[PDB]
Amino acid sequence: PNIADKGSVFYHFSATSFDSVDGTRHYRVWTAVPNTTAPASGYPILYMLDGNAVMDRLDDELLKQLSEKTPPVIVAVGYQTNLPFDLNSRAYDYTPAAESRKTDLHRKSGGSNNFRQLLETRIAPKVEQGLNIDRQRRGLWGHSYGGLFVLDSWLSSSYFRSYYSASPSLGRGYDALLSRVTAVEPLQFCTKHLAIMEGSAGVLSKIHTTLTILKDKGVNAVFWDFPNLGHGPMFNASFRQALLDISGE
Numbered sequence: 001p002n003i004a005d006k007g008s009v010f011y012h013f014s015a016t017s018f019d020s021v022d023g024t025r026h027y028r029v030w031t032a033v034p035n036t037t038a039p040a041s042g043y044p045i046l047y048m049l050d051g052n053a054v055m056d057r058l059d060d061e062l063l064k065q066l067s068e069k070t071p072p073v074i075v076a077v078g079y080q081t082n083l084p085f086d087l088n089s090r091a092y093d094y095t096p097a098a099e100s101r102k103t104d105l106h107r108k109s110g111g112s113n114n115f116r117q118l119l120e121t122r123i124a125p126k127v128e129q130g131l132n133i134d135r136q137r138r139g140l141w142g143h144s145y146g147g148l149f150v151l152d153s154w155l156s157s158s159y160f161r162s163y164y165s166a167s168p169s170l171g172r173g174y175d176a177l178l179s180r181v182t183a184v185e186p187l188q189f190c191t192k193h194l195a196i197m198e199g200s201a202g203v204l205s206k207i208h209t210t211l212t213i214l215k216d217k218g219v220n221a222v223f224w225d226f227p228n229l230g231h232g233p234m235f236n237a238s239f240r241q242a243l244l245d246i247s248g249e
Ligand SMILES: *P(=O)(OC(C)C)OC(C)C
Pocket: 143, 144, 145, 146, 170, 171, 172, 231
């Protein structure tokens, strides 16, 4: 969050707060707007989960590089906490039903549809007011449970055009979600770009088939590989590469 507090020559920031409908989760949303002028068709915009951790890792070198191409509006959707994650809240908000199948691991799970309604009908309309946004260039990113949320949203949403799903293979219901992803009807998901991002290191077998089937179904689906990265470097790589990609790299 602190780069928002400090300011950047490349971008200006504001922060807004929202509550879940059940009243028990409390969101802190940072909007970073480029200080360079938007193209006439508007800024691309990337909505990013785990927003507190994204803001802690955002730095001027990335903002400078984004500004070499078409810098996006960045919406970091975080929590009212002084830690980089709200582990309880994200396990609820980011996960679909399937994540708790045949287990007693479940911090409760299964809040993805209510969090998507909050995001698409409450947070996004508010933070886009007053900005020239290129709606065809609206993207969503998340890692780990956040990567499951992105797959869940690629299946159900009409709001975003680009979906960057990082490390979803870490989730228990990864295969169940891939099974739904490759079951979609031909052509209906053609306007929803899907970018699967994996590092960590099979998983790759699953992804190549996934890409093959989705292509056959008319989907622009791609794989970003960050070989042998640990969790921290992969969190960083995938969010920064998603920003760079949506800026036009
Ligand atoms: P992710 O939300 O985070 C890893 C970096 C530990 O993990 C879930 C899938 C267990």
